[PDB]
Amino acid sequence: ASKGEELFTGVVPILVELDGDVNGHKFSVSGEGEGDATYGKLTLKFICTTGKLPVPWPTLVTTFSYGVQCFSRYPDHMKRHDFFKSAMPEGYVQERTIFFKDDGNYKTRAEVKFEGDTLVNRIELKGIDFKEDGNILGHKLEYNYNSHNVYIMADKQKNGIKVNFKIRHNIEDGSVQLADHYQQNTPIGDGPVLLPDNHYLSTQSALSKDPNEKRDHMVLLEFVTAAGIT
């Protein structure tokens, strides 16, 4: 019904690459998996290629995925509102500032585009102002994830979208660390893109470990479905 969709009818290979620096600590992670937009589902495995990840794995989930929202299932009646797939194959730039409450912040820039037959997400991250005793550099986060809604509005002026949401990360003492996300997506290409009416993406994630894997790693399963328009 609209072009770009067609790239996503089957199961699509995903490549994720991140280079980061948090308070001066540098690290890289690579990830691979597959996305099925028909079901609204992603499976990804991430490996820290530089040793042991210096921040908790859960703090990077939205950066890696929250990272490939072109795999969202859009119900037929709101397929006119799917910015993410409409920007493909050329892709889009995704930028965020993520504010951890009472702590530092991540600033990220990513490019999400087709390189051949695989969808690749290449990311740069800088984090600063983190306390060495805080929930993040202290590694007090539980290894798990909650459900969140991700709110989307068009930004007519940038030919893109603005996205806001707050992540609730469970701390191992029973409290919650809030992570306020501000996001901006703009097409890499020249062509028209679909600028949406306000809606949101219902997102669920589950984190596990491959018990055969000796590297520091995260396995991520995620289900994402668009909603909010009648």
PDB file of C-alpha atoms in Angstrom:
ATOM      1  CA  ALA A   1       0.000   0.000   0.000  1.00  0.00           C
ATOM      2  CA  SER A   2       2.996   2.289   0.509  1.00  0.00           C
ATOM      3  CA  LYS A   3       6.609   1.876  -0.624  1.00  0.00           C
ATOM      4  CA  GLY A   4       9.312   0.857   1.874  1.00  0.00           C
ATOM      5  CA  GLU A   5       6.946  -1.545   3.555  1.00  0.00           C
ATOM      6  CA  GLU A   6       7.901  -4.158   0.972  1.00  0.00           C
ATOM      7  CA  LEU A   7      11.440  -4.354   2.379  1.00  0.00           C
ATOM      8  CA  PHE A   8       9.953  -5.678   5.602  1.00  0.00           C
ATOM      9  CA  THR A   9       7.601  -8.431   4.526  1.00  0.00           C
ATOM     10  CA  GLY A  10       9.972 -11.259   5.531  1.00  0.00           C
ATOM     11  CA  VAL A  11      12.505 -11.799   8.299  1.00  0.00           C
ATOM     12  CA  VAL A  12      15.307  -9.221   7.946  1.00  0.00           C
ATOM     13  CA  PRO A  13      18.944  -9.655   9.236  1.00  0.00           C
ATOM     14  CA  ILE A  14      20.123  -6.937  11.642  1.00  0.00           C
ATOM     15  CA  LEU A  15      23.603  -5.649  12.337  1.00  0.00           C
ATOM     16  CA  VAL A  16      24.256  -3.402  15.300  1.00  0.00           C
ATOM     17  CA  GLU A  17      27.528  -1.588  16.045  1.00  0.00           C
ATOM     18  CA  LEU A  18      28.198   0.761  18.877  1.00  0.00           C
ATOM     19  CA  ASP A  19      31.211   2.763  19.925  1.00  0.00           C
ATOM     20  CA  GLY A  20      30.872   4.457  23.215  1.00  0.00           C
ATOM     21  CA  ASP A  21      32.635   6.449  25.830  1.00  0.00           C
ATOM     22  CA  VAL A  22      31.118   6.968  29.263  1.00  0.00           C
ATOM     23  CA  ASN A  23      33.046   9.230  31.644  1.00  0.00           C
ATOM     24  CA  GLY A  24      36.151   8.392  29.568  1.00  0.00           C
ATOM     25  CA  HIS A  25      35.622   4.610  29.682  1.00  0.00           C
ATOM     26  CA  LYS A  26      35.609   3.415  26.110  1.00  0.00           C
ATOM     27  CA  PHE A  27      33.999   0.232  24.820  1.00  0.00           C
ATOM     28  CA  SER A  28      32.489  -1.274  21.717  1.00  0.00           C
ATOM     29  CA  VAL A  29      29.702  -3.734  21.209  1.00  0.00           C
ATOM     30  CA  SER A  30      28.551  -5.604  18.129  1.00  0.00           C
ATOM     31  CA  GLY A  31      25.171  -7.297  17.811  1.00  0.00           C
ATOM     32  CA  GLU A  32      23.309  -9.400  15.280  1.00  0.00           C
ATOM     33  CA  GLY A  33      19.812 -10.827  15.011  1.00  0.00           C
ATOM     34  CA  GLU A  34      16.616 -10.637  13.003  1.00  0.00           C
ATOM     35  CA  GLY A  35      13.516  -8.595  12.815  1.00  0.00           C
ATOM     36  CA  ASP A  36      10.018  -9.564  11.803  1.00  0.00           C
ATOM     37  CA  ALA A  37       7.837  -6.524  11.341  1.00  0.00           C
ATOM     38  CA  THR A  38       4.802  -8.633  10.432  1.00  0.00           C
ATOM     39  CA  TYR A  39       4.795  -9.919  13.978  1.00  0.00           C
ATOM     40  CA  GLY A  40       6.403  -6.847  15.444  1.00  0.00           C
ATOM     41  CA  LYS A  41       9.279  -8.822  16.834  1.00  0.00           C
ATOM     42  CA  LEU A  42      13.066  -8.610  17.239  1.00  0.00           C
ATOM     43  CA  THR A  43      15.668 -11.071  18.482  1.00  0.00           C
ATOM     44  CA  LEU A  44      19.189  -9.691  19.059  1.00  0.00           C
ATOM     45  CA  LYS A  45      22.414 -10.825  20.674  1.00  0.00           C
ATOM     46  CA  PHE A  46      25.087  -8.266  21.704  1.00  0.00           C
ATOM     47  CA  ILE A  47      28.763  -8.945  22.549  1.00  0.00           C
ATOM     48  CA  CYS A  48      31.167  -6.457  24.188  1.00  0.00           C
ATOM     49  CA  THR A  49      34.168  -6.707  21.893  1.00  0.00           C
ATOM     50  CA  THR A  50      36.439  -4.717  24.222  1.00  0.00           C
ATOM     51  CA  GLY A  51      36.198  -6.750  27.389  1.00  0.00           C
ATOM     52  CA  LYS A  52      33.548  -6.290  30.064  1.00  0.00           C
ATOM     53  CA  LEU A  53      30.911  -3.642  29.509  1.00  0.00           C
ATOM     54  CA  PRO A  54      31.669  -0.769  31.863  1.00  0.00           C
ATOM     55  CA  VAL A  55      27.967   0.181  32.262  1.00  0.00           C
ATOM     56  CA  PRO A  56      24.910  -2.053  33.005  1.00  0.00           C
ATOM     57  CA  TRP A  57      23.490  -3.806  29.923  1.00  0.00           C
ATOM     58  CA  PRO A  58      19.946  -2.556  30.552  1.00  0.00           C
ATOM     59  CA  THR A  59      21.029   1.126  30.084  1.00  0.00           C
ATOM     60  CA  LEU A  60      21.811   0.468  26.393  1.00  0.00           C
ATOM     61  CA  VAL A  61      18.647  -1.407  25.339  1.00  0.00           C
ATOM     62  CA  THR A  62      16.869   1.611  23.795  1.00  0.00           C
ATOM     63  CA  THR A  63      20.103   2.601  22.021  1.00  0.00           C
ATOM     64  CA  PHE A  64      20.621  -0.800  20.414  1.00  0.00           C
ATOM     65  CA  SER A  65      16.930  -1.308  19.716  1.00  0.00           C
ATOM     66  CA  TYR A  66      14.549   1.221  20.802  1.00  0.00           C
ATOM     67  CA  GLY A  67      17.056   1.439  18.160  1.00  0.00           C
ATOM     68  CA  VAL A  68      15.413  -0.262  15.188  1.00  0.00           C
ATOM     69  CA  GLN A  69      11.768   0.775  15.457  1.00  0.00           C
ATOM     70  CA  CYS A  70      11.246   0.108  11.762  1.00  0.00           C
ATOM     71  CA  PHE A  71      10.454  -3.433  12.925  1.00  0.00           C
ATOM     72  CA  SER A  72       7.294  -2.200  14.726  1.00  0.00           C
ATOM     73  CA  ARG A  73       4.081  -3.863  13.678  1.00  0.00           C
ATOM     74  CA  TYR A  74       1.707  -1.165  12.374  1.00  0.00           C
ATOM     75  CA  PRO A  75      -1.931  -2.325  12.170  1.00  0.00           C
ATOM     76  CA  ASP A  76      -3.375  -1.941   8.656  1.00  0.00           C
ATOM     77  CA  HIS A  77      -5.391   1.106   9.581  1.00  0.00           C
ATOM     78  CA  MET A  78      -2.343   3.045  10.719  1.00  0.00           C
ATOM     79  CA  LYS A  79       0.166   2.035   8.054  1.00  0.00           C
ATOM     80  CA  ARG A  80      -0.104   5.581   6.685  1.00  0.00           C
ATOM     81  CA  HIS A  81       1.705   6.693   9.853  1.00  0.00           C
ATOM     82  CA  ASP A  82       4.794   4.481   9.610  1.00  0.00           C
ATOM     83  CA  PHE A  83       7.631   7.019   9.250  1.00  0.00           C
ATOM     84  CA  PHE A  84      10.255   4.393  10.009  1.00  0.00           C
ATOM     85  CA  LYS A  85       9.653   2.083   7.030  1.00  0.00           C
ATOM     86  CA  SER A  86       8.946   5.012   4.685  1.00  0.00           C
ATOM     87  CA  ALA A  87      12.521   6.255   5.096  1.00  0.00           C
ATOM     88  CA  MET A  88      13.963   2.979   3.813  1.00  0.00           C
ATOM     89  CA  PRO A  89      16.232   1.860   2.104  1.00  0.00           C
ATOM     90  CA  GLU A  90      18.133   5.121   2.539  1.00  0.00           C
ATOM     91  CA  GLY A  91      17.402   5.171   6.229  1.00  0.00           C
ATOM     92  CA  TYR A  92      17.185   7.750   8.951  1.00  0.00           C
ATOM     93  CA  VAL A  93      19.381   9.368  11.549  1.00  0.00           C
ATOM     94  CA  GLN A  94      18.261   8.777  15.093  1.00  0.00           C
ATOM     95  CA  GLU A  95      19.546  11.112  17.797  1.00  0.00           C
ATOM     96  CA  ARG A  96      18.858  11.107  21.530  1.00  0.00           C
ATOM     97  CA  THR A  97      19.696  12.645  24.812  1.00  0.00           C
ATOM     98  CA  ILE A  98      18.898  10.267  27.648  1.00  0.00           C
ATOM     99  CA  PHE A  99      18.792  11.796  31.083  1.00  0.00           C
ATOM    100  CA  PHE A 100      19.244   9.451  34.047  1.00  0.00           C
ATOM    101  CA  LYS A 101      17.510  11.081  37.003  1.00  0.00           C
ATOM    102  CA  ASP A 102      19.980  12.229  39.647  1.00  0.00           C
ATOM    103  CA  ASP A 103      22.819  11.067  37.402  1.00  0.00           C
ATOM    104  CA  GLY A 104      24.544  11.570  34.038  1.00  0.00           C
ATOM    105  CA  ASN A 105      23.311  11.506  30.470  1.00  0.00           C
ATOM    106  CA  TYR A 106      23.922   9.684  27.217  1.00  0.00           C
ATOM    107  CA  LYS A 107      23.933  11.500  23.898  1.00  0.00           C
ATOM    108  CA  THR A 108      23.700   9.213  20.913  1.00  0.00           C
ATOM    109  CA  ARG A 109      23.631   9.461  17.172  1.00  0.00           C
ATOM    110  CA  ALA A 110      22.825   6.559  14.993  1.00  0.00           C
ATOM    111  CA  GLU A 111      22.241   5.753  11.361  1.00  0.00           C
ATOM    112  CA  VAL A 112      19.710   3.092  10.521  1.00  0.00           C
ATOM    113  CA  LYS A 113      19.716   1.989   6.897  1.00  0.00           C
ATOM    114  CA  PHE A 114      19.893  -0.971   4.524  1.00  0.00           C
ATOM    115  CA  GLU A 115      23.368  -2.042   3.547  1.00  0.00           C
ATOM    116  CA  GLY A 116      22.671  -4.732   0.991  1.00  0.00           C
ATOM    117  CA  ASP A 117      20.168  -7.178   2.455  1.00  0.00           C
ATOM    118  CA  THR A 118      20.648  -6.394   6.144  1.00  0.00           C
ATOM    119  CA  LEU A 119      19.356  -3.580   8.260  1.00  0.00           C
ATOM    120  CA  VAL A 120      22.228  -1.997  10.143  1.00  0.00           C
ATOM    121  CA  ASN A 121      22.239   0.309  13.118  1.00  0.00           C
ATOM    122  CA  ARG A 122      25.548   2.137  13.654  1.00  0.00           C
ATOM    123  CA  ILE A 123      25.761   4.171  16.839  1.00  0.00           C
ATOM    124  CA  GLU A 124      27.950   6.631  18.605  1.00  0.00           C
ATOM    125  CA  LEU A 125      27.411   7.227  22.280  1.00  0.00           C
ATOM    126  CA  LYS A 126      28.929   9.663  24.740  1.00  0.00           C
ATOM    127  CA  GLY A 127      27.988   9.640  28.389  1.00  0.00           C
ATOM    128  CA  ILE A 128      29.037  12.106  30.996  1.00  0.00           C
ATOM    129  CA  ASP A 129      28.299  13.362  34.486  1.00  0.00           C
ATOM    130  CA  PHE A 130      27.928   9.877  35.901  1.00  0.00           C
ATOM    131  CA  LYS A 131      28.534   9.337  39.605  1.00  0.00           C
ATOM    132  CA  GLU A 132      31.023   6.543  40.422  1.00  0.00           C
ATOM    133  CA  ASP A 133      28.671   5.596  43.257  1.00  0.00           C
ATOM    134  CA  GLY A 134      25.465   6.061  41.286  1.00  0.00           C
ATOM    135  CA  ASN A 135      23.039   3.398  40.112  1.00  0.00           C
ATOM    136  CA  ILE A 136      24.735   3.267  36.714  1.00  0.00           C
ATOM    137  CA  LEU A 137      28.498   3.288  37.394  1.00  0.00           C
ATOM    138  CA  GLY A 138      27.712   1.413  40.569  1.00  0.00           C
ATOM    139  CA  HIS A 139      25.947  -1.371  38.596  1.00  0.00           C
ATOM    140  CA  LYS A 140      22.889  -1.514  40.869  1.00  0.00           C
ATOM    141  CA  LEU A 141      20.382  -2.159  38.070  1.00  0.00           C
ATOM    142  CA  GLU A 142      18.580  -5.488  37.891  1.00  0.00           C
ATOM    143  CA  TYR A 143      19.130  -7.411  34.684  1.00  0.00           C
ATOM    144  CA  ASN A 144      15.548  -7.167  33.387  1.00  0.00           C
ATOM    145  CA  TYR A 145      13.197  -4.794  31.556  1.00  0.00           C
ATOM    146  CA  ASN A 146       9.602  -3.374  31.778  1.00  0.00           C
ATOM    147  CA  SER A 147       6.936  -2.358  29.271  1.00  0.00           C
ATOM    148  CA  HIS A 148       6.837   1.196  27.972  1.00  0.00           C
ATOM    149  CA  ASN A 149       4.881   3.327  25.578  1.00  0.00           C
ATOM    150  CA  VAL A 150       6.857   5.457  23.144  1.00  0.00           C
ATOM    151  CA  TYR A 151       5.108   8.634  22.002  1.00  0.00           C
ATOM    152  CA  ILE A 152       5.550   9.878  18.440  1.00  0.00           C
ATOM    153  CA  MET A 153       4.683  13.159  16.794  1.00  0.00           C
ATOM    154  CA  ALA A 154       5.607  14.587  13.429  1.00  0.00           C
ATOM    155  CA  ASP A 155       8.109  17.431  13.181  1.00  0.00           C
ATOM    156  CA  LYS A 156       6.929  19.057   9.931  1.00  0.00           C
ATOM    157  CA  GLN A 157       9.800  21.543  10.044  1.00  0.00           C
ATOM    158  CA  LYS A 158      12.520  18.858  10.023  1.00  0.00           C
ATOM    159  CA  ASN A 159      10.620  16.427   7.762  1.00  0.00           C
ATOM    160  CA  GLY A 160      10.934  13.921  10.614  1.00  0.00           C
ATOM    161  CA  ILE A 161       9.481  12.914  13.971  1.00  0.00           C
ATOM    162  CA  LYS A 162      10.090  13.716  17.644  1.00  0.00           C
ATOM    163  CA  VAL A 163       9.804  10.903  20.159  1.00  0.00           C
ATOM    164  CA  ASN A 164       9.558  11.063  23.974  1.00  0.00           C
ATOM    165  CA  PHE A 165       9.299   8.437  26.701  1.00  0.00           C
ATOM    166  CA  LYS A 166      10.601   7.568  30.183  1.00  0.00           C
ATOM    167  CA  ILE A 167      12.182   4.186  30.902  1.00  0.00           C
ATOM    168  CA  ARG A 168      11.798   2.711  34.392  1.00  0.00           C
ATOM    169  CA  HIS A 169      14.803   0.584  35.322  1.00  0.00           C
ATOM    170  CA  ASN A 170      14.441  -1.568  38.418  1.00  0.00           C
ATOM    171  CA  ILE A 171      17.157  -1.123  40.983  1.00  0.00           C
ATOM    172  CA  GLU A 172      18.259  -4.087  42.960  1.00  0.00           C
ATOM    173  CA  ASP A 173      17.058  -2.498  46.210  1.00  0.00           C
ATOM    174  CA  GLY A 174      13.451  -2.097  45.063  1.00  0.00           C
ATOM    175  CA  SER A 175      13.547   1.500  43.808  1.00  0.00           C
ATOM    176  CA  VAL A 176      13.364   2.695  40.223  1.00  0.00           C
ATOM    177  CA  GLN A 177      15.946   4.687  38.191  1.00  0.00           C
ATOM    178  CA  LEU A 178      14.175   6.915  35.649  1.00  0.00           C
ATOM    179  CA  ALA A 179      15.679   7.452  32.211  1.00  0.00           C
ATOM    180  CA  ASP A 180      14.080  10.335  30.329  1.00  0.00           C
ATOM    181  CA  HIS A 181      14.490   9.951  26.548  1.00  0.00           C
ATOM    182  CA  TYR A 182      14.344  12.718  24.005  1.00  0.00           C
ATOM    183  CA  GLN A 183      14.587  11.595  20.458  1.00  0.00           C
ATOM    184  CA  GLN A 184      14.690  12.952  16.907  1.00  0.00           C
ATOM    185  CA  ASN A 185      14.589  11.033  13.647  1.00  0.00           C
ATOM    186  CA  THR A 186      15.258  12.605  10.221  1.00  0.00           C
ATOM    187  CA  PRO A 187      15.489  10.831   6.824  1.00  0.00           C
ATOM    188  CA  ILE A 188      18.905  10.289   5.256  1.00  0.00           C
ATOM    189  CA  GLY A 189      17.370  10.237   1.801  1.00  0.00           C
ATOM    190  CA  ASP A 190      15.920  12.700  -0.667  1.00  0.00           C
ATOM    191  CA  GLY A 191      12.487  11.104  -1.119  1.00  0.00           C
ATOM    192  CA  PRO A 192       9.184  11.821   0.620  1.00  0.00           C
ATOM    193  CA  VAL A 193       8.635  10.278   4.032  1.00  0.00           C
ATOM    194  CA  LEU A 194       5.362   9.623   5.942  1.00  0.00           C
ATOM    195  CA  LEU A 195       4.911  12.238   8.659  1.00  0.00           C
ATOM    196  CA  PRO A 196       2.536  10.725  11.245  1.00  0.00           C
ATOM    197  CA  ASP A 197      -0.402  11.842  13.339  1.00  0.00           C
ATOM    198  CA  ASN A 198       0.342  11.432  17.066  1.00  0.00           C
ATOM    199  CA  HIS A 199       0.400   7.790  18.152  1.00  0.00           C
ATOM    200  CA  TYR A 200       2.596   5.552  20.262  1.00  0.00           C
ATOM    201  CA  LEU A 201       4.436   2.269  20.162  1.00  0.00           C
ATOM    202  CA  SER A 202       3.670  -0.272  22.826  1.00  0.00           C
ATOM    203  CA  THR A 203       7.015  -1.933  23.599  1.00  0.00           C
ATOM    204  CA  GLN A 204       7.921  -5.012  25.633  1.00  0.00           C
ATOM    205  CA  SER A 205      11.425  -6.408  26.201  1.00  0.00           C
ATOM    206  CA  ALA A 206      12.960  -9.416  27.936  1.00  0.00           C
ATOM    207  CA  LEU A 207      16.734  -9.829  28.627  1.00  0.00           C
ATOM    208  CA  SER A 208      18.530 -13.138  29.008  1.00  0.00           C
ATOM    209  CA  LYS A 209      21.946 -14.814  28.840  1.00  0.00           C
ATOM    210  CA  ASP A 210      23.019 -17.523  26.455  1.00  0.00           C
ATOM    211  CA  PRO A 211      24.421 -20.041  28.939  1.00  0.00           C
ATOM    212  CA  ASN A 212      27.000 -21.258  26.341  1.00  0.00           C
ATOM    213  CA  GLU A 213      28.529 -17.785  25.923  1.00  0.00           C
ATOM    214  CA  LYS A 214      31.669 -16.800  27.778  1.00  0.00           C
ATOM    215  CA  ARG A 215      31.822 -13.222  26.494  1.00  0.00           C
ATOM    216  CA  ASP A 216      30.049 -10.428  28.221  1.00  0.00           C
ATOM    217  CA  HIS A 217      26.775 -10.342  26.334  1.00  0.00           C
ATOM    218  CA  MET A 218      23.008  -9.651  26.276  1.00  0.00           C
ATOM    219  CA  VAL A 219      20.241 -11.505  24.466  1.00  0.00           C
ATOM    220  CA  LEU A 220      17.230  -9.178  23.815  1.00  0.00           C
ATOM    221  CA  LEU A 221      13.712 -10.220  22.753  1.00  0.00           C
ATOM    222  CA  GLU A 222      11.322  -7.395  21.998  1.00  0.00           C
ATOM    223  CA  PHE A 223       7.734  -7.038  20.746  1.00  0.00           C
ATOM    224  CA  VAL A 224       6.603  -3.665  19.390  1.00  0.00           C
ATOM    225  CA  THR A 225       3.177  -2.636  18.160  1.00  0.00           C
ATOM    226  CA  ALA A 226       1.824   0.753  17.100  1.00  0.00           C
ATOM    227  CA  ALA A 227      -1.349   2.113  18.688  1.00  0.00           C
ATOM    228  CA  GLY A 228      -3.265   5.267  19.571  1.00  0.00           C
ATOM    229  CA  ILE A 229      -5.087   6.206  16.328  1.00  0.00           C
ATOM    230  CA  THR A 230      -8.656   5.133  15.502  1.00  0.00           C
TER     231      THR A 230
END
